[PDB]
């Protein structure tokens, strides 16, 4: 749901995202701040695009998961977009991993290279109390 910044640090560390694919949770948490404000239920919609963002990392339902009746959904994460907004973060993390597993990495969302493009984001997870 709508949690705080420190919760996101332990949330990704509990799943194993802390220091995954060469990136650190510090960059992953700084993105969730502007992406959904540390909110898993946060989801964006589309106007005739068949791509609804679902999850704390805003994942569209046309190239990552399928919400239910989305034909464009490629099912990259292979799951339900609705689970990404649910309290369970496993779908948000499992689908987020697939997004960074590509050659782009953590550069899929523009908000990451706008406020965290190779910036000092270590303070986001450093000093949380894990």
Residues facing residue 47 across a β-bridge: none
Look up tokens 């700084």; give the residue.
30
Which technique?
Answer: NMR
DSSP letter for each residue of 23-84:
B-HHHHHHHHHHHTSSBSS-EE--SSSS--EETTTTB-TTTT-B-SS-SS---SS-SBHHHH
Residues tagged active-site? 35, 53
Write down the CATH number for the domain with range 1-130.
1.10.530.10
* Phi and psi based region of residue 114 (left: phi greater than 0; alpha: psi -120 to 50; beta: remaining): alpha
Let me know: does 5 contact 26? Beta carbons within 8 Å: no
Give the residue among 44, 70, 48 at the shortest CA–CA distance from 62. 70
C-beta atoms surrounding 12 within 10 Å: 24
Give the residue among 36, 65, 35 at the shortest CA–CA distance from 51. 65
* Phi and psi based region of residue 118 (left: phi greater than 0; alpha: psi -120 to 50; beta: remaining): left
């Amino acid at each position: 749901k709508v949690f705080e910044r420190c919760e996101l640090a332990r949330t990704l560390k509990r799943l194993g995202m802390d220091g995954y694919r060469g990136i650190s949770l510090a960059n992953w948490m700084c993105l969730a701040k502007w992406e959904s404000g540390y909110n898993t239920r946060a989801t964006n919609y589309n106007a005739g695009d068949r791509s609804t963002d679902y999850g704390i990392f805003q994942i569209n339902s046309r190239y990552w998961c399928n919400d239910g009746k989305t034909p464009g959904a490629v099912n990259a994460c292979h799951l339900s977009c609705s689970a990404l907004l649910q309290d369970n973060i496993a779908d948000a993390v499992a689908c987020a991993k697939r997004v960074v597993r590509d050659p782009q990495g953590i550069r899929a969302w523009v908000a990451w290279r706008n406020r965290c493009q190779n910036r000092d984001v270590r303070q986001y997870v450093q000093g949380c109390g894990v």
